[PDB]
Coordinates of C-alpha atoms (C1' of nucleotides) and ligand atoms in Angstrom, one line a residue:
Chain C
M23 CA 0.0 -0.1 0.1
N24 CA 1.0 3.7 -0.3
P25 CA 1.8 4.6 3.4
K26 CA 0.6 8.1 2.7
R27 CA -3.0 6.9 2.5
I28 CA -2.9 6.1 6.4
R29 CA -2.9 8.7 9.2
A30 CA -2.5 7.6 12.8
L31 CA -5.4 9.0 15.0
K32 CA -4.0 7.4 18.2
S33 CA -0.9 5.8 19.2
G34 CA -0.6 2.8 21.5
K35 CA 0.3 -0.7 22.4
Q36 CA -1.2 -3.4 19.8
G37 CA -3.4 -6.0 21.4
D38 CA -3.4 -9.8 20.3
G39 CA -7.0 -9.4 19.4
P40 CA -8.7 -8.9 16.0
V41 CA -8.2 -5.9 13.6
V42 CA -11.3 -3.9 13.7
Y43 CA -12.3 -2.0 10.5
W44 CA -14.9 0.5 11.5
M45 CA -16.7 1.0 8.2
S46 CA -18.6 4.2 7.9
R47 CA -18.2 6.0 4.5
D48 CA -16.9 3.3 2.1
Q49 CA -19.5 0.5 2.0
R50 CA -18.0 -1.9 -0.4
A51 CA -15.9 -5.1 0.0
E52 CA -13.7 -4.3 -3.1
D53 CA -11.5 -1.4 -3.9
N54 CA -11.2 -0.3 -0.2
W55 CA -7.8 0.9 0.8
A56 CA -9.1 0.9 4.6
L57 CA -10.4 -2.8 4.5
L58 CA -7.2 -3.7 2.6
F59 CA -5.0 -2.1 5.1
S60 CA -7.0 -3.8 8.1
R61 CA -6.4 -7.1 6.4
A62 CA -2.8 -6.4 6.1
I63 CA -2.5 -5.1 9.7
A64 CA -4.3 -8.3 10.6
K65 CA -2.0 -10.6 8.4
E66 CA 1.4 -9.9 9.9
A67 CA -0.3 -10.0 13.5
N68 CA -1.7 -13.6 12.8
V69 CA -5.0 -12.2 14.0
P70 CA -8.3 -12.1 12.0
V71 CA -9.9 -8.9 10.6
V72 CA -13.4 -7.9 11.2
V73 CA -15.9 -5.0 10.0
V74 CA -18.1 -3.2 12.4
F75 CA -20.6 -0.7 11.2
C76 CA -22.7 1.7 13.3
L77 CA -26.2 2.4 12.4
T78 CA -27.1 5.8 13.8
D79 CA -30.4 7.7 14.6
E80 CA -29.4 10.0 11.4
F81 CA -32.0 8.1 9.3
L82 CA -34.8 9.7 10.8
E83 CA -33.4 12.9 9.5
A84 CA -33.9 11.7 5.9
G85 CA -36.1 9.3 4.1
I86 CA -37.1 5.8 3.3
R87 CA -35.4 6.2 -0.1
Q88 CA -31.7 6.6 1.4
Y89 CA -32.6 4.2 4.1
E90 CA -33.3 1.3 1.9
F91 CA -30.6 2.2 -0.6
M92 CA -28.1 2.1 2.4
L93 CA -29.6 -1.1 3.9
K94 CA -29.8 -3.2 0.9
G95 CA -26.1 -2.3 -0.1
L96 CA -25.1 -3.5 3.4
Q97 CA -27.1 -6.8 3.0
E98 CA -25.0 -7.5 -0.1
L99 CA -21.8 -6.6 1.5
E100 CA -22.7 -9.0 4.5
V101 CA -22.4 -11.9 2.0
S102 CA -19.4 -10.5 0.3
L103 CA -17.6 -10.0 3.5
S104 CA -18.7 -13.5 4.7
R105 CA -17.5 -15.2 1.6
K106 CA -14.0 -13.9 2.4
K107 CA -14.4 -15.4 6.0
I108 CA -14.9 -11.8 7.4
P109 CA -17.7 -11.5 10.0
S110 CA -19.4 -8.2 9.9
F111 CA -21.1 -6.7 12.9
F112 CA -23.9 -4.0 13.1
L113 CA -24.1 -1.8 16.3
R114 CA -27.3 0.1 16.8
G115 CA -26.7 3.3 18.6
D116 CA -24.1 6.0 18.9
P117 CA -20.5 5.5 17.6
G118 CA -18.8 7.4 20.3
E119 CA -20.4 5.0 22.7
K120 CA -21.1 1.9 20.8
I121 CA -17.8 1.3 18.8
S122 CA -15.6 2.2 22.1
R123 CA -17.5 -0.3 24.2
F124 CA -17.2 -2.8 21.2
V125 CA -13.6 -2.5 20.9
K126 CA -13.7 -3.3 24.8
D127 CA -15.8 -6.4 24.4
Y128 CA -13.8 -8.1 21.7
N129 CA -10.3 -7.3 22.8
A130 CA -9.5 -5.4 19.5
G131 CA -5.7 -5.0 19.1
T132 CA -5.9 -2.1 16.5
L133 CA -8.7 0.1 15.1
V134 CA -9.2 1.4 11.6
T135 CA -11.8 3.6 10.0
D136 CA -12.2 5.4 6.7
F137 CA -11.9 9.2 6.3
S138 CA -14.7 11.5 6.0
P139 CA -14.6 15.4 6.5
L140 CA -18.1 15.7 8.0
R141 CA -18.1 17.4 11.4
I142 CA -19.9 14.6 13.2
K143 CA -17.3 12.0 12.4
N144 CA -14.6 14.0 13.9
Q145 CA -16.9 14.3 17.0
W146 CA -17.1 10.4 17.0
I147 CA -13.5 9.8 16.6
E148 CA -12.6 12.2 19.1
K149 CA -14.9 10.5 21.7
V150 CA -13.7 7.1 20.4
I151 CA -10.0 8.2 21.0
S152 CA -10.7 9.4 24.3
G153 CA -11.9 5.8 25.4
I154 CA -9.7 3.3 24.0
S155 CA -6.1 2.3 24.4
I156 CA -5.3 0.6 21.2
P157 CA -3.8 2.1 18.0
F158 CA -6.4 3.9 15.9
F159 CA -5.7 4.3 12.3
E160 CA -7.4 6.3 9.6
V161 CA -7.2 5.6 5.9
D162 CA -8.4 7.7 3.1
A163 CA -10.2 5.3 0.8
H164 CA -12.7 7.7 -0.7
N165 CA -10.4 10.0 -2.7
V166 CA -7.5 9.2 -5.2
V167 CA -5.2 11.4 -3.5
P168 CA -5.7 11.4 0.3
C169 CA -7.3 14.7 1.5
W170 CA -4.6 15.8 3.5
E171 CA -2.0 15.4 0.9
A172 CA -3.5 17.1 -2.2
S173 CA -3.8 20.3 -0.1
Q174 CA -2.7 21.7 3.2
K175 CA -5.1 24.8 2.9
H176 CA -8.4 25.5 1.5
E177 CA -8.2 25.9 -2.1
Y178 CA -9.8 29.1 -3.4
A179 CA -11.0 27.5 -6.7
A180 CA -10.5 24.5 -9.0
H181 CA -7.7 25.8 -11.0
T182 CA -5.7 26.8 -7.9
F183 CA -6.3 23.0 -6.9
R184 CA -6.2 21.2 -10.3
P185 CA -2.4 21.7 -10.7
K186 CA -1.5 20.2 -7.1
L187 CA -3.8 17.3 -7.6
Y188 CA -2.4 16.4 -10.9
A189 CA 1.3 16.5 -9.8
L190 CA 0.5 13.6 -7.3
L191 CA -1.6 11.4 -9.8
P192 CA 1.1 9.2 -11.1
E193 CA 1.8 8.1 -7.6
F194 CA -1.7 7.8 -6.3
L195 CA -3.5 6.3 -9.5
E196 CA -2.6 2.7 -8.8
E197 CA -4.5 -0.7 -9.1
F198 CA -6.2 -2.2 -6.1
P199 CA -4.5 -5.4 -4.8
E200 CA -7.2 -8.1 -4.2
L201 CA -8.9 -8.6 -0.7
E202 CA -7.2 -11.6 0.5
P203 CA -9.5 -13.7 2.8
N204 CA -9.2 -14.6 6.4
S205 CA -7.5 -17.6 7.8
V206 CA -9.5 -17.8 11.1
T207 CA -12.9 -16.9 12.6
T219 CA -29.7 -8.5 12.5
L220 CA -30.1 -6.6 9.3
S221 CA -33.7 -7.6 8.1
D222 CA -35.1 -6.6 11.6
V223 CA -33.3 -3.4 11.5
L224 CA -34.8 -2.8 8.0
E225 CA -38.4 -3.5 8.7
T226 CA -38.2 -1.5 12.1
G227 CA -36.6 1.7 10.6
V228 CA -39.0 1.7 7.7
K229 CA -42.1 1.6 10.1
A230 CA -40.4 4.7 11.8
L231 CA -40.2 6.6 8.6
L232 CA -43.4 5.6 7.3
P233 CA -45.5 8.7 8.5
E234 CA -43.0 11.0 6.9
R235 CA -43.3 9.4 3.3
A236 CA -43.9 11.7 0.5
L237 CA -47.1 10.7 -0.8
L238 CA -49.3 11.7 -3.8
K239 CA -52.8 12.8 -3.3
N240 CA -53.6 8.9 -3.2
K241 CA -51.5 6.8 -0.9
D242 CA -49.2 5.7 -3.8
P243 CA -45.8 7.0 -2.9
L244 CA -44.0 9.7 -4.6
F245 CA -40.6 7.9 -4.7
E246 CA -39.9 5.7 -7.7
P247 CA -37.3 3.2 -6.6
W248 CA -36.6 1.5 -9.9
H249 CA -34.1 4.1 -11.2
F250 CA -31.0 2.8 -9.3
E251 CA -30.5 -0.6 -7.6
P252 CA -28.4 -0.4 -4.5
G253 CA -25.2 -2.4 -3.9
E254 CA -21.7 -3.1 -5.5
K255 CA -22.9 -5.6 -8.1
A256 CA -25.4 -2.8 -9.1
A257 CA -22.9 0.0 -9.0
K258 CA -20.4 -1.6 -11.5
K259 CA -23.0 -2.3 -14.1
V260 CA -23.7 1.4 -13.9
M261 CA -20.0 2.3 -14.5
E262 CA -19.7 -0.3 -17.3
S263 CA -22.8 0.9 -18.9
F264 CA -21.7 4.6 -18.8
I265 CA -18.2 3.6 -20.3
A266 CA -19.9 1.6 -23.0
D267 CA -23.1 3.8 -23.6
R268 CA -22.8 7.3 -22.3
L269 CA -19.1 8.5 -21.8
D270 CA -18.7 8.8 -25.4
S271 CA -21.2 11.8 -25.5
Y272 CA -20.6 13.0 -21.8
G273 CA -18.8 16.3 -22.7
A274 CA -21.3 17.3 -25.2
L275 CA -24.7 16.4 -23.6
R276 CA -24.1 16.4 -19.9
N277 CA -25.7 19.9 -19.6
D278 CA -28.8 18.8 -21.3
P279 CA -31.5 17.7 -18.8
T280 CA -33.5 15.7 -21.6
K281 CA -30.8 13.4 -22.6
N282 CA -29.8 11.0 -20.1
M283 CA -26.0 11.3 -20.5
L284 CA -25.0 11.5 -16.9
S285 CA -22.9 8.9 -15.2
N286 CA -25.6 8.4 -12.5
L287 CA -22.8 7.1 -10.2
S288 CA -23.3 9.6 -7.5
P289 CA -25.8 7.8 -5.2
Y290 CA -23.3 4.9 -5.2
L291 CA -20.1 7.1 -4.5
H292 CA -21.9 8.8 -1.7
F293 CA -22.5 5.5 0.1
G294 CA -19.1 4.2 -1.0
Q295 CA -20.7 1.2 -2.8
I296 CA -18.0 2.0 -5.5
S297 CA -14.6 3.5 -5.9
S298 CA -13.7 6.5 -7.9
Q299 CA -10.3 5.1 -8.1
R300 CA -11.7 2.2 -9.9
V301 CA -13.7 4.4 -12.1
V302 CA -10.8 6.5 -13.1
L303 CA -8.8 3.5 -13.7
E304 CA -11.5 2.2 -16.0
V305 CA -12.1 5.6 -17.8
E306 CA -8.3 6.3 -18.1
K307 CA -8.2 3.0 -20.1
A308 CA -11.3 3.3 -22.1
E309 CA -11.0 4.8 -25.6
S310 CA -13.6 7.6 -26.6
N311 CA -13.7 11.3 -27.2
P312 CA -10.6 12.8 -25.3
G313 CA -12.7 15.9 -24.4
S314 CA -15.3 13.6 -22.6
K315 CA -12.7 11.8 -20.5
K316 CA -11.0 15.3 -19.7
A317 CA -14.4 16.6 -18.9
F318 CA -15.4 13.5 -16.9
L319 CA -11.9 13.1 -15.0
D320 CA -12.4 16.7 -13.9
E321 CA -15.7 16.0 -12.1
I322 CA -14.8 12.8 -10.3
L323 CA -11.2 14.0 -9.9
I324 CA -11.1 18.1 -9.4
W325 CA -14.6 18.7 -8.2
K326 CA -15.2 15.7 -6.1
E327 CA -12.0 16.1 -4.1
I328 CA -12.1 19.7 -3.7
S329 CA -15.6 19.3 -2.1
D330 CA -13.7 17.1 0.6
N331 CA -11.1 19.7 0.8
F332 CA -13.9 22.5 1.4
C333 CA -15.6 20.6 4.3
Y334 CA -12.2 19.5 5.8
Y335 CA -10.6 22.9 6.1
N336 CA -13.8 24.9 6.9
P337 CA -15.8 23.4 9.8
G338 CA -18.7 26.0 9.1
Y339 CA -19.2 24.7 5.6
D340 CA -23.0 24.4 6.1
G341 CA -23.4 28.0 6.9
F342 CA -23.0 31.6 5.7
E343 CA -19.8 32.4 7.2
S344 CA -17.9 29.8 5.1
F345 CA -18.5 32.1 2.1
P346 CA -15.7 34.4 0.6
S347 CA -15.5 37.9 1.9
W348 CA -16.6 39.4 -1.5
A349 CA -19.8 37.1 -1.5
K350 CA -20.7 38.0 1.9
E351 CA -20.2 41.7 1.7
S352 CA -22.3 41.5 -1.5
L353 CA -25.3 39.6 -0.3
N354 CA -25.2 41.8 2.9
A355 CA -25.9 44.9 1.0
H356 CA -28.9 43.5 -0.8
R357 CA -30.6 41.8 2.4
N358 CA -33.0 44.9 2.1
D359 CA -34.0 44.3 -1.3
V360 CA -37.5 43.6 -2.4
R361 CA -37.8 40.1 -3.4
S362 CA -39.8 39.4 -6.7
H363 CA -41.3 36.5 -4.8
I364 CA -40.8 34.9 -1.4
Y365 CA -41.7 31.2 -0.8
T366 CA -41.6 29.2 2.3
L367 CA -39.8 25.9 2.7
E368 CA -43.2 24.0 2.4
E369 CA -43.9 25.8 -1.0
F370 CA -40.4 24.9 -2.5
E371 CA -40.8 21.4 -1.3
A372 CA -44.0 21.0 -3.2
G373 CA -43.3 22.6 -6.5
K374 CA -45.7 25.6 -6.1
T375 CA -43.8 28.5 -7.3
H376 CA -44.6 30.4 -10.4
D377 CA -41.7 29.0 -12.4
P378 CA -42.8 25.7 -14.1
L379 CA -39.3 24.9 -14.9
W380 CA -38.4 25.1 -11.3
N381 CA -41.3 23.1 -10.3
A382 CA -40.2 20.6 -12.9
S383 CA -36.7 20.0 -11.3
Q384 CA -38.1 19.6 -7.8
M385 CA -40.6 17.2 -9.4
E386 CA -37.4 15.3 -10.7
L387 CA -35.8 15.5 -7.3
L388 CA -39.1 14.3 -5.5
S389 CA -39.9 11.3 -7.4
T390 CA -36.5 10.0 -8.8
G391 CA -34.2 10.8 -6.0
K392 CA -31.8 12.4 -8.3
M393 CA -32.0 15.8 -9.8
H394 CA -30.0 16.6 -13.1
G395 CA -26.6 18.1 -12.6
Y396 CA -27.4 21.2 -14.6
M397 CA -30.7 21.9 -13.0
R398 CA -29.2 21.5 -9.4
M399 CA -27.6 25.0 -10.2
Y400 CA -30.8 26.8 -11.5
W401 CA -32.6 25.1 -8.7
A402 CA -30.5 26.3 -6.1
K403 CA -30.1 29.9 -7.4
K404 CA -33.8 30.4 -7.7
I405 CA -34.2 29.5 -3.9
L406 CA -32.0 32.3 -3.1
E407 CA -33.7 34.9 -5.5
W408 CA -36.9 34.0 -4.0
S409 CA -36.4 33.5 -0.2
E410 CA -36.4 36.2 2.5
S411 CA -32.7 36.1 3.4
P412 CA -29.5 34.3 2.3
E413 CA -29.5 32.1 5.3
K414 CA -33.0 31.1 4.8
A415 CA -32.0 30.2 1.3
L416 CA -29.2 28.0 2.3
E417 CA -31.4 26.5 5.2
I418 CA -33.8 25.5 2.5
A419 CA -31.4 24.3 -0.2
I420 CA -29.6 22.3 2.4
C421 CA -32.8 20.7 3.9
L422 CA -34.3 19.7 0.6
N423 CA -31.0 18.4 -1.1
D424 CA -30.5 16.3 2.0
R425 CA -34.1 15.3 2.6
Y426 CA -34.6 14.1 -0.9
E427 CA -31.5 13.5 -2.9
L428 CA -30.1 10.1 -2.8
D429 CA -26.6 11.5 -2.8
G430 CA -27.5 13.8 -0.1
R431 CA -25.8 14.4 3.3
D432 CA -22.5 14.7 1.3
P433 CA -19.4 16.9 1.1
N434 CA -20.3 17.4 -2.7
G435 CA -23.6 18.6 -1.3
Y436 CA -22.3 21.6 0.8
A437 CA -19.8 22.4 -1.7
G438 CA -22.2 22.8 -4.4
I439 CA -25.0 24.6 -2.4
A440 CA -22.0 26.9 -1.4
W441 CA -21.1 27.5 -5.1
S442 CA -24.7 28.1 -5.8
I443 CA -25.7 30.6 -3.2
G444 CA -22.3 31.8 -2.1
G445 CA -19.6 32.2 -4.6
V446 CA -17.5 29.4 -2.9
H447 CA -15.0 28.1 -5.6
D448 CA -16.6 30.7 -8.0
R449 CA -15.9 34.4 -8.9
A450 CA -17.9 37.7 -9.1
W451 CA -20.3 38.6 -11.9
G452 CA -22.3 41.6 -12.6
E453 CA -24.1 43.1 -9.7
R454 CA -28.1 42.5 -9.3
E455 CA -30.9 43.1 -7.0
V456 CA -31.3 40.5 -4.3
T457 CA -28.4 38.3 -5.8
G458 CA -25.7 40.9 -5.5
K459 CA -22.8 39.6 -7.5
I460 CA -23.5 35.9 -7.2
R461 CA -23.6 34.3 -10.6
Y462 CA -27.1 34.4 -12.2
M463 CA -29.2 31.9 -14.2
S464 CA -32.3 32.7 -16.2
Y465 CA -35.3 30.9 -17.6
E466 CA -34.3 32.1 -21.1
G467 CA -30.7 30.8 -20.6
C468 CA -32.0 27.5 -20.3
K469 CA -34.2 27.9 -23.5
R470 CA -30.9 28.3 -25.6
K471 CA -29.5 25.3 -24.1
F472 CA -32.1 22.6 -24.2
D473 CA -35.7 21.9 -24.8
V474 CA -37.0 23.1 -21.5
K475 CA -40.7 22.6 -22.7
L476 CA -39.7 18.9 -22.7
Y477 CA -38.3 18.9 -19.2
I478 CA -41.5 20.5 -18.0
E479 CA -43.8 17.9 -19.8
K480 CA -41.8 15.1 -18.2
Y481 CA -42.9 16.2 -14.7
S482 CA -46.5 17.2 -14.3
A483 CA -47.0 15.1 -11.2
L484 CA -48.2 18.2 -9.3
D485 CA -51.6 16.6 -9.1
Chain Q
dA1 C1' 5.2 41.8 -9.6
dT2 C1' 2.3 42.3 -12.5
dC3 C1' -1.1 40.4 -15.4
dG4 C1' -3.5 36.8 -17.3
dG5 C1' -7.6 33.6 -16.5
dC6 C1' -11.2 31.6 -14.2
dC7 C1' -23.2 32.9 -16.6
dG8 C1' -26.5 36.0 -19.8
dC9 C1' -27.4 38.1 -24.5
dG10 C1' -26.7 39.7 -29.4
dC11 C1' -25.9 38.0 -33.9
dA12 C1' -25.0 35.1 -37.9
Chain S
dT1 C1' -30.8 25.3 -31.0
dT2 C1' -25.1 26.3 -32.3
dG3 C1' -20.4 28.9 -31.2
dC4 C1' -18.4 33.3 -30.5
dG5 C1' -16.7 37.4 -28.6
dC6 C1' -18.0 40.4 -25.2
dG7 C1' -19.6 42.0 -20.4
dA8 C1' -19.0 42.6 -15.1
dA9 C1' -16.2 41.3 -11.5
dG10 C1' -12.4 39.8 -7.7
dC11 C1' -8.5 37.4 -6.6
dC12 C1' -4.9 33.7 -6.8
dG13 C1' -0.4 32.6 -8.1
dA14 C1' 3.5 32.4 -11.1
Ligands
LIG1 C1 -27.7 22.5 -5.6 C2 -26.6 21.4 -5.6 C3 -26.8 20.3 -4.9 C4 -25.7 19.2 -4.9 C5 -24.8 19.2 -5.9 C6 -24.6 20.4 -6.7 C7 -25.6 21.3 -6.6 C8 -25.4 22.5 -7.6 N1 -24.0 18.0 -5.9 C9 -22.9 18.0 -6.9 C10 -23.4 17.5 -8.4 O1 -24.5 18.3 -8.7 C11 -23.8 16.1 -8.3 O2 -22.5 15.4 -8.0 C12 -24.2 15.5 -9.6 O3 -25.7 15.8 -9.8 C13 -24.1 14.0 -9.5 O4 -24.6 13.3 -10.7 P1 -23.7 12.5 -11.5 O5 -23.0 11.4 -10.8 O6 -24.7 11.6 -12.6 O7 -22.6 13.3 -12.2 P2 -21.6 13.1 -13.3 O8 -21.6 11.8 -13.8 O9 -21.9 14.3 -14.3 O10 -20.1 13.6 -12.7 C14 -19.3 12.5 -12.1 C15 -18.9 12.8 -10.7 O11 -18.3 13.9 -10.5 C16 -18.4 14.7 -9.3 N2 -19.1 15.8 -9.3 C17 -19.7 16.4 -10.4 N3 -20.4 17.5 -10.2 C18 -19.9 18.0 -9.0 C19 -19.9 19.1 -8.3 N4 -20.8 20.1 -8.8 N5 -19.5 19.3 -7.1 C20 -18.7 18.2 -6.7 N6 -18.5 17.0 -7.3 C21 -19.0 17.0 -8.5 C22 -19.4 13.6 -8.6 O12 -18.7 12.6 -7.8 C23 -20.0 12.9 -9.7 O13 -20.5 11.5 -9.1 C24 -24.1 16.9 -5.0 N7 -23.6 15.9 -5.4 C25 -23.9 14.8 -4.6 O14 -23.5 13.6 -5.0 N8 -24.6 14.9 -3.5 C26 -25.4 16.0 -3.2 O15 -26.1 16.1 -2.4 C27 -25.1 17.2 -4.1 N9 -25.7 18.3 -3.9

DNA sequence: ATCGGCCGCGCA
DNA sequence: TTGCGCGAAGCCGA
């Protein structure tokens, strides 16, 4: 392995027990530097390796959609892990408390976890550390270049980062060694329970039939690769030319998978790098899964207040501040955005996409978020509403990409200043009639007339 | 260090 | 739609 992928959280004396992978971000058996390094740590100690996963009360914040998607992936995983002689454990409760006392009851010798920049994982690590005595290691198994090596600071923009990332690629774009099995050694309750809790929340139509359409993305690792293979076969060729067209389905659709870690962007890059297509579409594509995915981890990592206004740049703040007192053309409540009840049938279209399919088109996520700012009573409330709805309804929600992209949208983060307007100040602008020139908006709107 | 280099709209 | 030069605007980094 490349040792720069490991960062020791806590130094201690190794016990003669198992090596415990605390799986959290990367829910896949294959192409997992964290599970691979736990195996290795467990090989040269003549100890087994085990995976432990903590199911927290964070599901009641979102929807059945994300909760099945994650719990069906887990159920596949369990078989995969088990076929490698790796037992996998499922703790119901609070990582800080639960993993600690688990490390206790099993006499773990070493503790490993994947990397994730979201505030709450630092809280749980920091509590975990304060209650164990064995080494605690962290591995970046989500980014091609570990987040702390691509950049030490907050990168102001894509092209300040892009050079630093691309110097390090020859060294970190490597092949994955295969998970060598162990030599020595209840999820269906958890599903049916958690579903009965979420059920009063489900998004129904005027009739009981649920809004959510689950047949657009199957969960799991096996699914995730048939999406990557199909992309490379079918859509990668035209990606750079038709990605901004919400009517052609040319996106890679891999983002529900990556969020849950059911597939490795490192594998995707390896596979794309070796595919033969339009160079500009590889170039377009690598830049999203390479520069924009990982600058998003950098954003949350180096700015703990990423889900708030303060993390904007001083020009964006100063600008939005001066237009706090402007007269909003319209003002809608959260409930009114949430139900696609604005004057903008194109905007209600996109929210209709988000509502029923669980994934809004990459281009329309920009428009949808800017109009939220334009038609709310304050930037803070606009952030508050874009965050809530992105996370409540998007299958890829609750993700660094999420905050890094609402922050681009509402706040200039990783962007520049444009001509000054009412309400929006100097934040980039998007218009109905700018979409008219780029794609058949009449056709998007027709797709989604599920407003009942 | 000094300066290039990151949507909307007219027009053909 | 389909591409281009132009516009408004701030700041990094070489
Ligand atoms: C308002 C708003 C809200 C969100 C987001 C953007 C905006 C403007 N994003 C980011 C982006 O819009 C999203 O990754 C794509 O819609 C994912 O669809 P595909 O995987 O099909 O992208 P596509 O195949 O075109 O891109 C490939 C990959 O590049 C990365 N990427 C693309 N666009 C990016 C962006 N703008 N920022 C960061 N990484 C990017 C992702 O890893 C994506 O899987 C996001 N993404 C996400 O997964 N979860 C979320 O909750 C949000 N939230």
